[PDB]
Design a protein around this ligand. Structure first.
Ligand code: GRT
Ligand code: CL
Ligand code: MG
Ligand code: MG
Ligand code: MG
Ligand code: MG
Lengths: 240, 204, 219, 196, 231, 244, 243, 241
C-alpha cells in the first residue's frame, strides 16, 4: 500500500473543461430536488425524502442537517458525500472558528470553508470531486439572514431563492414568479411546499418531505435553526 | 531574572457611562537602568484597544501578532473585530503557548459598536480571562493600582470624570513603583471619538 | 476556590464560590466557576484557572461534535473519560481540578477529576483550597437521596464554609441544579457578604490631573 | 492501601480497603480499588490512582478486543497485558497491581505485579502500604483449598489488621468473589471488622 | 504481452513476465559451474571480455571466510546481493559469534529477491548466483534464481550453454561427490564440466576463474597463472 | 500501478508549450471579462459577472473583485474557488511582510509571490494548475499606482490598461484606441464600462451583471482608499456615463 | 476490457481477475495436502525431482510457525515463504503480548487479513500460493487452507496444486469411511498414499515425499517432521497401495 | 475507459467500480434477513457448505462485533472479515475513548463513512460487501442498520439482502402492511426467530434443515448466534403448527 495517486484526477481538457467537475454536476442533476427560499425574517430549506425502501425508516436518514445552531444545510446528489461534508463543516466550525473566537462562524465564512474543502477535492492528488451541490441557509448578527449554494467546483453564490437537482430548471422559474423582497417566513414555507410539490411524483406529506428553517431564536441566545416536524408540515399542507 | 519585571511598566483600564478608558506609563528599562520614556503599551485594532505590560519583546511581538490576526479577521469577516470577540482571540492565542508563554499582562478595552456596551477585560500570561466590569489592572505596580482603583473608582462616570479617576490611579500607583512612570498616556474612548492625553508626572 | 457537588434524589447539585485570586490579591469578586460541558452536564473548576477553562471548553466542544454525530445527549462517563485521558496524558501539568456533574439516560452522576488524571465517582465531593471547610459540612450533614431544596441548602452551606473559613475562597455562591426535567443555573444563588460601603468620595474634580498634550480622532 | 487476592477451592477472592489519601487528608473514604477488566478477571490496584486507573482501562480495552476475536482470555493473558504495560512504562508508572481471575479449566488464579513490572503467580498475594503489617499474619494463617467462608474470614481478618496499623488504609473492606457460580460483591463495615 | 509492463502483474496463465525476462538475462550471461564433494565445494567460471583490449569481467565474489558465490547476468545486481550476503554473514559473526549456515544464506537471498517481484516500482534482480560454502553440516552448493527460487544441489551450472555442463555433472554425480580430501581433482572435474559448455573459444589463462572452500580451506579465488595448472 | 491513470500535468508538448497551462488559459477565455485601467490619480477595476439570474443576491455576492489588503485588490477571471485559495495565500503574505518589516507589502513583491506559486504547479507536484488569471490593482510609495496581471503559467506583467477573461482581443484593441497617459480616474471609469459594453456577450450591460471598484489616493490627507462599489452605486455610474 | 490488467479492479462481473490469475499459478504448482486427525493435523507435499543433482531431503518445503503450527503451500514458493515470514511475525507479536501461543483460528485470520490486503491496491500483486496450515491449540486440532483472495475455511482435509482433484477425491473417501475419526499415525500413512496417487498428474518427473505432523499424543502438540523409519513406513504403505 | 477501473466519475455521473462492488455482493449466493421483536433483533442467513471436506462450524457470515452488536455480511468472506475486524476494532476503541458501548447505528455510520472514502480515494477499492448491523440499543431499542459499498447507510424496521432480496423484502413488506407496526409483536426471541425462518421459507419457497440456516439474536446487553441444535428446536416448533 502506497497511495501512489499523488497527481490530479481532475485536469483541464483541450476545450478548457474540467471533466470531473462537469460529471459531478451531472451526478447532482440526477439527484432529488432540493430548494431554498429567503424571507425577510427567516430562510427555509426543503427537499424530498426519497425513501429507498418502505421498510427503511426515513426518519433516520437526515437530508437536512444542522451545521451550527444558526446554520443549516441541505443537498442534492450523492448522500454519502454530503454526510462527510456535514461532518467536516461541523468540525471546522469549531476548530478554525469557535475555539479561536468563542462564537460560531457567520454563514458566509462557514460556506467559504466548505467550498474550500470541495475545491481541494477538485485539485488534490488521488481524489474525485464531491458529487453534491449544497444549499446552506443561515443567520448571523452582522450579516442577518442568508442563503448560499455550493457546487462541486467549490464555487458558491448567494441566493434569494433557488433550487438544485432533478427539477431545478422548472422550480427556479416557479420561484422567480413567486419571490419578492417582502416575504414573511410563513409565506416562504408556503412557496417552498408549492415548488416542491411539482418535482415530487408519489406521496406528498410530512413523512416524505424534509423541511427546516433559520428563523427566530428558540428558547446566551437560542438556536435559530429548526427542523419542522412531520405534523407541522401536514398542518401547512391543509392551507395549500 | 523574573521576565515580568525586567522592563517594568503598567496598564489600567476602566469603564464609565457610555465610555471606557485605558491608560499606561511610558517606561522601558533594564531593571534599574531607564532606557526609553516613549515606550507606549496601548495599541488598537480598529475600535478595540489592547494594553500590554510585561516583557517588552513579547509586548511588541503580541502587538504585531494581534495586528496580523485582526487584519485577516477584517478581510474575511468584512467588519472590524469587536472587544468580546478579540478578548477570546487573545485568550486562545496566549493559551496556545501554555508551556512556553508570553510573559505579558494584556488588557482589552473598547465599546461594542453594535450594542454600544462598554467592555474591558484582563488576562494572566496563559490566557485566563479576568472579566470585570469595574476595572482591570496590570504590570509591576498592579497591587498599587488595585488599591488606587478600589478606593477611587465608582460606576457610571462621565468621560472627563473617568479621566481624572484613571489618571490619578495610574500616576499615584506608578510613583510607588521603581520600574513604572517616566510619563503616561490616557485614552478616553467613546462610541465614535477617542481622546488620547499624555500626562505630566515626575521623571524619576 | 471552593467548589462542591452532591447527588440528590432527582439529580445533581453543583456549587462554587466566585473569588478569582492572583497571589494574595483578588482580581475578580464575581467570577463564574461553574462551566457548561453539554446541556445535561456541568463542570465546577478549581486549580489553575486557564487550564480549567480551556480543558472544559475543549471537551465541551468535542462532546458537541460527538453528540451531533450520534444524535443523542452525551453521557457524564464520556465527559469524564475525555477529561481524564487528556489530563493523564499531560501528567499533571494541566492543573485542572474539576467537579463534574450531570444527568444521563442512565441517571445522575458526579465525579471529581484531578490534574493527574484520576477520577472518583461519588455521591458528594469538594475541591479547591476550601475543600476541607466544605467537606466538613458534608460529613456533618450529608445523607443519600435528599430532596432538591435540602441538597441546595447543603451545597450552599458547604460553599459558605469555604468562603468564610478559607482565604482563597470568597464572594457569592453559585449553584447548578441538574435533573431529568430541568437545568437551573443559579448565579448568584446567595450573596453572603455585602460589598463594603465607602464613607468618603475620593474622586477628583475635572482639571485636577496635569495634561501635556491631547488628540481627538473620530470613528 | 491494603489489597489482597486469595485462591480457594471454588475459585478466588479479591479484597481491598477503601481509603485514598492526599498526604494526611482522606480524599476518598469509599474508594472501589477492585476493578473489573473482564467478566471474571478483576484486579486490585495500589500506587498512583491516575496510573492504575489508566492501566486498568487500557487492559479492559485489550481484553474486550481479544474477546471479540479469540473468545474469553485466560487470567494469565490478562496478567501478561498488565505486565507489558507496567514493565515497558516502568520509568513513568507507580503501579502495584494484583490480577485475579476464574477460568473453568484453571479455576482460581492470582498474579501479582509489583513496581518493577515483574509477574509472580501465587496462591495468594498481598500488596499496598498496609500489606507490610500482615506478612506475618497471612503467612501463618493461609491454607490452600479453603472454603468460601474461610477465605472471606481470612481476608477480613488480614485487612482488618492492615487497616488497624496503616493510616493510609481504612474505611470499608470490599471483596469480590470469583467462582463458577458468578461474581459476588461483598462489603464489611468498620463496626464489624474492628471488633475482630 | 500486455502483462509484462511491470513485476506487479500476473499474466492470464499465472506468469510473471518481468521475472521471466530477468531470468533471460542470466541465459545471456557467461557460463559458470558449481559442484561439491563431502569435503570441498568448487566454483568454476568462464569470464567474458568486451574485446581483446578489455579485461575479463570478474564472476566470483567472496562473502565470508567460509562462503562465496559466482554470478551470471547483471554484475551490478550480483554486487548488491553479494554485499547483502556479506552483511548477513557479518551480522551472524558479530552478534552470535556464529558462521552463517549456507542453507540460511539461501533463505535470506530468496526473500530479498522475492520483495522485488511483488511490489510496484522496482524490478527483479537480473542475475543468477551459485553460492558455495563450508559450514557446520559440511560442504554446500546452492543455485539462486532471481524469481526467488533457491535450490541446494550436488552440482549445477548457469548461463549461456550451461545445459552441457549440467548434463556432464548429471552423469558424473557418483564420481565427483566421492572426491574427498583432494581439492585439485574436484577442480579438474569442474574444469572438465565447464568445458562441455564451450564453443569456438577454449579455456585460456585470463579467461578462467576458479574458487574453492572446504574443511581446512578458506574461500579463496584463483585467477591468472594460478589456474594455468588446470588448463 | 497508478502510473496508468497519470495525466502528467507538468510536461512540455513537442512545440515547447505546457499543455495544462494552455488549456487553463482556454478555460479562462470563457470567464467573464475583467478590466483594469490605471490613471494618474487612481486605478479602476471593472468586471462582468456571468450567467446571472434575477434571484442571485447581488449585494452580498463577490465572484470577481477581492481585497488583499488596504492598498491592493484583485479582479478574477476563471475558477472562483481556485482564486480564493490563491487570494487567502496572498492575504497572508501581505500580513507576514507587514509583521516582519512593519511596512505594507510593495505591490510587485506580492504579485511575484503569487505568480511564483502558480509557476510551481506548472513545474512540479503533478497537480493541475490554478485556472485563474488575476488583475492586480495596487498602490505603494515606491512606484505609486500599479496594474499587473498573472495567469496559470506564473508569468506576470505590468500594464497601464489590461483585460482578462472573455473577448480580451477585442477589449485590448478598444482600450489601446482610447487610452491616454494623462487620463484621470473618472475618464478611466468611463473607458472601462464602455469597453465592457461593447465586448459583452450579453444583450445589454446592466448593474446586476457588474462588479466595480476604484483605488484612489483621492482621499483627505493623501491616503489610499479602496472603494468596492455597491449595486446601487454601479447603477448610478452606468447612468452617469450614459450606458443605461 | 482492461479489468484484468490491474490488481484490485472489479470487472463488470464483480471479480478481481488478477486474483484469479494468481490462482492459475497455484494450480500450476506441485500437489500439497493437509489431513485433520483425532488429536492433530498432518501435512504432506509433492517435491518434483527436476534433476539427479538435487540433494535428497535438503530442499525442505514445509515450514514451521511458532513451535505448534505447520504451513505448506503450492505455487510460487517465494510468495509462500514471504507469507510464513509474516505469519511468524504475527505469532511472535501475539505471544509477546498475550503470553499464550497463537491459537490456530487466530493465526488463520492473521494470514487471511494480510493476503486480503494484497487484493486492495494496484501497487501490490496478490499471493501466488494456496497455503494449507494448522496445528494443535487449547481447543484441539485445526486444519486450514488459504487462497490468493484471502479466503480461508476450516477443513477435515485439504488439497491444492496440480493434483488437487485426485487428492480431494481421496480425502472425501477418508471422510466418509472414518466418521469416528483418523489417528495421527493413520493420517501420516494416508497422506503418503494421497501424494503418491496425486502424483499421476505430475507423472513425467519422479518426486520426493515430505510429511510433517502436529499431534497431542504423538508430538506433544508440537510441529515435527516425519523422518527416518516412520517416513519409510509411510512410503512403503503408499507404494503398496498404488500397486 | 479508465473511468470504469477506478472510482472517478463517468460522463453519466456514475461510479462503475461502486456498482461492480455491489455485484460482488451476491457472489456468495446467500440470502440474509433481519427483523425486530419487542425485546430483540433477529438476523437469519442461509448457510451453504458445498464441500464435504469443509469444517461446517467455521463456515459463517455472522460476526459478533461487540457484546451488544452483531453483524451479518452479504459478500465474499475476505472482505467480510476485513469489515468485521475493523468494526470490532472501532467498537473497542469507542468504548475506551467515550466510556460506553458503541451504539449499533454509530458503528454503521462509522463503517459507512469508511466505505465512502473508498468511493472518493482512487488507491483504495470498495469492499464488495453489504453489512447488516443488529443490536438492542439501550437508547433506541431493537436496531437494524445496513451499510453498502457506496457508503450509504440507513435504519430498518426489517431488511433482507442477497440475490433473492426482492422476494424476501416484499414478503416482509406485506406482513407489516397487515400488522401496521414496525416490529414482530412477540415476547420471546425464540418466536421472533421462528417468524424470521418461517417468512424466509415462504419467500424463497425452500424448506430448511438445521445445517441450512445460521441465526444471530440480539437481546439487551448481549448478541449471540444459535447452535445447530438451537435452530433444530426452532424448526421443530415451526413444523408442529
Ligand atoms: C480558585 C482555585 S484555588 C486558589 O486552588 O482554590 C480559582 C478557580 C477559578 C476557576 C475559574 C475561573 C475563571 N475561568 C477563575 C478561577 N483559581 C484561581 O484563583 C487561580 N488563579 C489564576 O489562575 C489567575 C487568574 C487571573 C485572571 C487572576 N492566574 C494566575 O494566578 C496565574 C497562574 C499561573 C502562573 C504561572 C503559570 C501558570 C499559571 N499567575 N499569573 N500571572
Ligand atoms: Cl467517521
Ligand atoms: Mg516612579
Ligand atoms: Mg528612575
Ligand atoms: Mg486506619
Ligand atoms: Mg477507489
Amino acid at each position: 500500500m502506497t497511495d501512489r495517486y499523488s497527481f490530479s484526477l481532475t485536469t483541464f481538457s483541450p476545450s478548457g473543461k474540467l471533466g470531473q467537475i462537469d460529471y459531478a454536476l451531472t451526478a447532482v442533476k440526477q439527484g432529488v430536488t432540493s430548494l431554498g427560499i429567503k424571507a425577510t425574517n427567516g430562510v427555509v430549506i426543503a427537499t424530498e425524502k426519497k425513501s429507498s425502501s418502505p421498510l427503511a425508516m426515513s426518519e433516520t436518514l437526515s437530508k437536512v442537517s444542522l451545521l451550527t445552531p444558526d446554520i443549516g444545510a441541505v443537498y442534492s446528489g450523492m448522500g454519502p458525500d454530503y454526510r462527510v461534508l456535514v461532518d467536516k463543516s461541523r468540525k471546522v466550525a469549531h476548530t478554525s472558528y469557535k475555539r479561536i473566537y468563542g462564537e460560531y462562524p457567520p454563514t458566509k465564512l462557514l460556506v467559504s470553508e466548505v467550498a474550500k474543502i470541495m475545491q481541494e477535492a477538485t485539485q488534490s492528488g488521488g481524489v474525485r470531486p464531491f458529487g453534491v451541490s449544497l444549499l446552506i441557509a443561515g443567520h448571523d448578527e452582522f450579516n442577518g439572514f442568508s442563503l448560499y449554494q455550493v457546487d462541486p467546483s467549490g464555487s458558491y453564490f448567494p441566493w434569494k431563492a433557488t433550487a438544485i437537482g432533478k427539477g431545478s430548471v422548472a422550480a427556479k422559474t416557479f420561484l422567480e414568479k413567486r419571490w419578492n423582497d417582502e416575504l414573511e417566513l410563513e409565506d416562504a414555507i408556503h412557496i417552498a411546499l408549492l415548488t416542491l410539490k411539482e418535482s415530487v411524483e408519489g406521496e406528498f406529506n410530512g413523512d416524505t418531505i424534509e423541511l427546516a428553517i433559520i428563523g427566530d431564536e428558540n428558547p446566551d441566545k437560542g438556536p435559530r435553526f429548526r427542523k419542522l416536524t412531520s405534523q407541522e408540515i401536514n398542518d401547512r399542507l391543509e392551507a395549500l | 531574572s523574573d521576565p515580568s519585571s525586567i522592563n517594568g511598566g503598567i496598564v489600567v483600564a476602566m469603564t464609565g457611562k457610555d465610555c471606557v478608558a485605558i491608560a499606561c506609563d511610558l517606561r522601558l528599562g533594564s531593571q534599574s537602568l531607564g532606557v526609553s520614556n516613549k515606550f507606549e503599551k496601548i495599541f488598537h485594532y480598529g475600535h478595540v484597544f489592547l494594553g500590554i505590560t510585561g516583557l517588552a519583546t513579547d509586548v511588541t511581538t503580541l502587538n504585531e501578532m494581534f495586528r496580523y490576526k485582526t487584519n485577516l479577521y477584517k478581510l474575511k469577516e468584512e467588519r472590524a473585530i469587536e472587544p468580546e470577540t478579540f478578548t477570546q482571540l487573545v485568550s486562545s492565542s496566549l493559551y496556545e503557548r501554555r508551556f512556553g508563554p508570553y510573559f505579558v499582562g494584556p488588557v482589552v478595552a473598547g465599546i461594542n459598536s453594535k450594542s454600544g456596551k462598554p467592555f474591558i477585560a484582563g488576562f494572566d500570561l496563559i490566557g485566563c480571562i479576568d472579566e470585570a466590569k469595574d476595572f482591570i489592572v496590570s504590570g509591576t505596580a498592579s497591587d498599587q493600582l488595585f488599591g488606587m482603583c478600589e478606593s477611587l473608582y465608582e460606576p457610571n462616570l462621565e468621560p472627563e470624570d473617568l479621566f481624572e479617576t484613571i489618571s490619578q490611579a495610574l500616576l499615584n500607583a506608578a510613583d510607588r513603583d521603581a520600574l513604572s512612570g517616566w510619563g503616561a498616556v490616557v485614552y478616553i474612548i467613546k462610541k465614535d471619538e477617542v481622546v488620547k492625553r499624555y500626562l505630566k508626572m515626575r521623571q524619576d | 476556590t471552593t467548589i462542591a457537588g452532591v447527588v440528590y434524589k432527582d439529580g445533581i447539585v453543583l456549587g462554587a464560590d466566585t473569588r478569582a485570586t492572583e497571589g494574595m490579591v483578588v482580581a475578580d469578586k464575581n467570577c463564574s466557576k461553574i462551566h457548561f460541558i453539554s446541556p445535561n452536564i456541568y463542570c465546577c473548576g478549581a486549580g489553575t484557572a486557564a487550564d480549567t477553562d480551556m480543558t472544559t471548553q475543549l471537551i465541551s466542544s468535542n462532546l458537541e461534535l460527538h453528540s451531533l454525530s450520534t444524535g443523542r445527549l452525551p453521557r457524564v462517563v464520556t465527559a469524564n473519560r475525555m477529561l481524564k485521558q487528556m489530563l493523564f496524558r499531560y501528567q499533571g501539568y494541566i492543573g485542572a481540578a474539576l467537579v463534574l456533574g450531570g444527568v444521563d439516560v442512565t441517571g445522575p452522576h458526579l465525579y471529581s477529576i484531578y490534574p493527574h488524571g484520576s477520577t472518583d465517582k461519588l455521591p458528594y465531593v469538594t475541591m479547591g483550597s476550601g475543600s476541607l471547610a466544605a467537606m466538613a459540612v458534608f460529613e456533618d450533614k450529608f445523607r443519600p437521596d435528599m430532596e432538591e431544596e435540602e441538597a441546595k441548602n447543603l451545597v450552599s452551606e458547604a460553599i459558605a464554609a469555604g468562603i468564610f473559613n478559607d482565604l482563597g475562597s470568597g464572594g457569592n455562591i453559585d449553584l447548578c441544579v441538574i435533573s431529568k426535567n430541568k437545568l437551573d443555573f443559579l448565579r448568584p444563588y446567595t450573596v453572603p457578604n455585602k460589598k463594603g460601603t465607602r464613607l468618603g468620595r475620593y474622586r477628583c474634580e475635572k482639571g485636577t490631573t496635569a495634561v501635556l498634550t491631547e488628540k481627538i480622532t473620530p470613528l | 492501601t491494603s489489597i489482597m487476592a486469595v485462591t480457594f477451592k471454588d475459585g478466588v477472592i479479591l479484597g481491598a480497603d477503601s481509603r485514598t489519601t492526599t498526604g494526611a487528608y482522606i480524599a476518598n473514604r469509599v474508594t472501589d480499588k477492585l476493578t473489573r477488566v473482564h467478566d471474571k478477571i478483576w484486579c486490585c490496584r495500589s500506587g498512583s490512582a491516575a496510573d492504575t486507573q489508566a492501566i486498568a482501562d487500557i487492559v479492559q480495552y485489550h481484553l474486550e478486543l481479544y474477546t471479540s476475536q479469540y473468545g474469553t482470555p485466560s487470567t494469565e493473558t490478562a496478567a501478561s497485558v498488565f505486565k507489558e504495560l507496567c514493565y515497558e512504562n516502568k520509568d513513568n508508572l507507580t503501579a502495584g497491581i494484583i490480577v485475579a481471575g476464574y477460568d473453568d479449566k484453571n479455576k482460581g488464579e492470582v498474579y501479582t505485579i509489583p513496581l518493577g513490572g515483574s509477574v509472580h503467580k501465587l496462591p495468594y498475594a498481598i500488596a499496598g502500604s498496609g500489606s507490610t503489617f500482615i506478612y506475618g499474619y497471612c503467612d501463618k494463617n493461609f491454607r490452600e483449598n479453603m472454603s468460601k467462608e474461610e477465605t472471606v474470614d481470612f481476608i477480613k481478618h488480614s485487612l482488618s489488621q492492615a487497616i488497624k496499623w496503616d493510616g493510609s488504609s481504612g474505611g470499608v473492606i470490599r471483596m469480590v468473589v470469583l467462582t463458577a457460580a458468578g461474581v459476588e460483591r461483598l462489603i464489611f463495615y468498620p463496626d464489624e471488622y474492628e471488633q475482630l | 504481452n500486455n502483462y509484462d509492463g511491470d513485476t506487479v502483474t500476473f499474466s492470464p496463465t499465472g506468469r510473471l513476465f518481468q521475472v521471466e525476462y530477468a531470468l533471460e538475462a542470466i541465459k545471456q550471461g557467461s557460463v559458470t559451474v558449481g559442484l561439491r564433494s563431502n569435503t570441498h565445494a568448487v566454483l568454476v567460471a568462464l569470464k567474458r571480455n568486451a574485446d581483446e583490449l578489455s579485461s575479463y569481467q570478474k564472476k566470483i565474489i567472496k562473502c565470508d571466510e567460509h562462503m562465496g558465490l559466482s554470478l551470471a547476468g547483471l554484475a551490478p545486481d550480483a554486487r548488491v546481493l553479494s554485499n547483502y550476503l556479506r552483511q548477513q554473514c557479518n551480522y551472524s559473526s558479530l552478534v552470535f559469534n556464529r558462521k552463517l549456515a549456507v542453507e540460511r544464506a539461501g533463505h535470506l537471498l530468496c526473500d530479498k529477491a522475492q520483495k522485488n517481484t511483488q511490489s510496484y516500482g522496482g524490478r527483479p534482480y537480473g542475475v543468477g548466483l551459485l553460492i558455495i560454502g563450508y559450514d557446520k553440516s559440511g560442504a554446500h552448493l546452492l543455485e539462486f534464481q532471481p524469481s526467488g527460487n533457491v535450490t541446494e544441489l550436488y552440482g549445477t551450472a548457469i548461463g549461456a550453454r550451461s545445459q552441457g555442463a549440467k548434463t556432464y555433472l548429471e552423469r558424473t554425480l557418483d564420481t565427483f561427490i566421492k572426491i574427498d580430501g583432494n581439492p585439485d581433482e574436484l577442480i579438474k572435474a569442474g574444469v572438465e564440466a565447464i568445458s562441455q559448455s564451450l564453443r569456438d573459444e577454449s579455456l585460456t589463462v585470463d579467461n578462467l576463474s576458479i574458487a574453492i572452500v572446504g574443511k581446512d580451506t578458506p574461500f579463496t579465488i584463483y585467477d591468472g597463472e594460478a589456474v594455468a595448472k588446470y588448463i | 500501478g497508478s502510473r496508468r491513470y497519470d495525466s502528467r500535468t507538468t510536461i512540455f508538448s513537442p512545440e515547447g508549450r505546457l499543455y495544462q497551462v494552455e488549456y487553463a488559459l482556454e478555460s479562462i477565455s470563457h470567464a467573464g471579462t475583467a478590466i483594469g485601467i490605471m490613471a494618474s490619480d487612481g486605478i479602476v477595476l471593472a468586471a462582468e459577472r456571468k450567467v446571472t439570474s434575477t434571484l442571485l443576491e447581488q449585494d452580498t455576492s463577490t465572484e470577481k473583485l477581492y481585497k488583499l489588503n488596504d492598498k491592493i485588490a484583485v479582479a478574477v477571471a476563471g475558477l472562483t474557488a481556485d482564486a480564493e485559495i490563491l487570494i487567502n495565500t496572498a492575504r497572508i503574505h501581505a500580513q507576514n511582510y507587514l509583521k516582519t518589516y512593519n511596512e505594507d507589502i510593495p505591490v510587485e513583491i506580492l504579485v511575484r509571490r503569487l505568480s511564483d506559486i502558480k509557476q510551481g504547479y506548472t513545474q512540479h507536484g503533478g497537480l493541475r494548475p490554478f485556472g485563474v488569471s488575476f488583475i492586480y490593482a495596487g498602490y505603494d510609495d515606491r512606484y505609486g499606482y500599479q496594474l499587473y496581471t498573472s495567469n496559470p503559467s506564473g508569468n506576470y506583467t505590468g500594464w497601464k490598461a489590461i483585460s482578462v477573461g472573455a473577448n480580451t482581443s477585442a477589449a485590448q484593441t478598444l482600450l489601446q484606441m482610447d487610452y491616454k497617459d494623462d487620463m484621470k480616474v473618472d475618464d478611466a471609469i468611463e473607458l472601462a464600462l464602455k469597453t465592457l459594453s461593447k465586448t459583452t456577450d450579453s444583450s445589454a450591460l446592466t448593474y446586476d451583471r457588474l462588479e466595480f471598484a476604484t483605488i484612489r489616493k483621492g482621499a483627505n490627507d493623501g491616503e489610499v482608499y479602496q472603494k468596492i462599489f455597491k449595486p446601487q452605486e454601479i447603477k448610478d455610474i452606468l447612468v452617469k456615463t450614459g450606458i443605461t | 476490457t482492461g479489468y484484468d490488467l490491474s490488481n484490485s479492479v472489479f470487472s463488470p462481473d464483480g471479480r478481481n481477475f488478477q486474483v484469479e490469475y494468481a490462482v492459475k499459478a497455484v494450480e500450476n504448482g506441485t500437489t500439497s495436502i493437509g489431513i485433520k486427525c483425532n488429536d492433530g493435523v498432518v501435512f504432506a507435499v509433492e517435491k518434483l525431482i527436476t534433476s539427479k543433482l538435487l540433494v535428497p531431503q535438503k530442499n525442505v518445503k514445509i515450514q514451521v510457525v511458532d513451535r505448534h503450527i505447520g504451513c505448506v503451500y503450492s505455487g510460487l514458493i517465494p510468495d509462500g515463504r514471504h507469507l510464513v515470514n509474516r505469519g511468524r511475525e504475527e505469532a511472535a507479536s501475539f505471544k509477546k503480548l498475550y503470553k499464550t501461543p497463537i491459537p490456530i483460528p487466530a493465526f488463520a485470520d492473521r494470514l487471511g487479513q494480510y493476503v486480503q490486503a494484497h487484493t486492495l491496491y494496484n501497487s501490490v500483486r496478490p499471493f501466488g500460493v494456496s497455503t494449507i496450515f494448522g496445528g494443535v491449540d487449547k481447543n484441539g486440532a485445526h486444519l486450514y487452507m488459504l487462497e490468493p483472495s484471502g479466503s480461508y475455511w476450516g477443513y477435515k482435509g485439504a488439497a491444492t496444486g496440480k493434483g488437487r482433484q485426485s487428492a480431494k477425491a481421496e480425502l472425501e473417501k477418508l471422510v466418509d469411511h472414518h466418521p469416528e475419526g483418523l489417528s495421527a499415525r493413520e493420517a501420516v500413512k494416508q497422506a503418503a498414499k494421497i501424494i503418491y496417487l496425486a502424483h499421476e498428474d505430475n507423472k513425467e518427473k519422479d518426486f520426493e515425499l515430505e510429511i510433517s505432523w502436529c499431534s497431542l499424543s504423538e508430538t506433544n502438540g508440537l510441529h515435527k517432521f516425519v523422518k527416518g523409519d516412520l517416513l519409510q513406513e509411510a512410503i512403503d504403505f503408499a507404494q503398496k497401495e498404488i500397486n | 475507459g479508465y473511468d470504469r477501473h477506478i472510482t472517478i466519475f463517468s460522463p453519466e455521473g456514475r461510479l462503475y467500480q461502486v456498482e461492480y462492488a455491489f455485484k460482488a455482493t451476491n457472489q456468495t449466493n446467500i440470502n440474509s434477513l433481519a427483523v425486530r421483536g419487542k425485546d430483540c433483533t433477529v438476523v437469519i442467513s442461509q448457510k451453504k457448505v458445498p464441500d464435504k471436506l469443509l469444517d461446517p462450524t467455521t463456515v459463517s457470515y455472522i460476526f459478533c462485533i461487540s457484546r451488544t452488536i452483531g453483524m451479518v455480511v452479504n459478500g465474499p468472506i475476505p472482505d467480510a472479515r476485513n469489515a468485521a475486524l475493523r468494526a470490532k476494532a472501532e467498537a473497542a476503541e469507542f468504548r475506551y475513548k467515550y466510556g460506553y458501548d458503541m451504539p449499533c447505528d454509530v458503528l454503521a455510520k462509522r463503517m459507512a463513512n469508511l466505505s465512502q472514502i473508498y468511493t472518493q480515494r482512487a488507491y483504495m477499492r470498495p469492499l464488495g460487501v453489504i453489512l447488516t448491523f443488529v443490536s438492542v440499543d439501550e437508547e433506541l431499542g431493537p436496531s437494524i442498520y445496513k451499510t453498502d459499498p457506496a457508503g450509504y447507510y440507513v435504519g430498518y424496521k426489517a431488511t433482507a439482502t442477497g440475490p433473492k432480496q426482492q422476494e424476501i423484502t416484499t414478503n416482509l413488506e406485506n406482513h407489516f402492511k397487515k400488522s401496521k407496526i414496525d416490529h414482530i409483536n412477540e415476547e420471546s426471541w425464540e418466536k421472533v426467530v421462528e417468524f424470521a425462518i418461517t417468512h424466509m421459507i415462504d419467500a424463497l419457497g425452500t424448506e430448511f434443515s438445521k445445517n441450512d440456516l445460521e441465526v444471530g439474536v440480539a437481546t439487551k446487553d448481549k448478541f449471540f448466534t444459535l447452535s445447530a441444535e438451537n435452530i433444530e428446536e426452532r424448526l421443530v416448533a415451526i413444523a408442529e403448527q
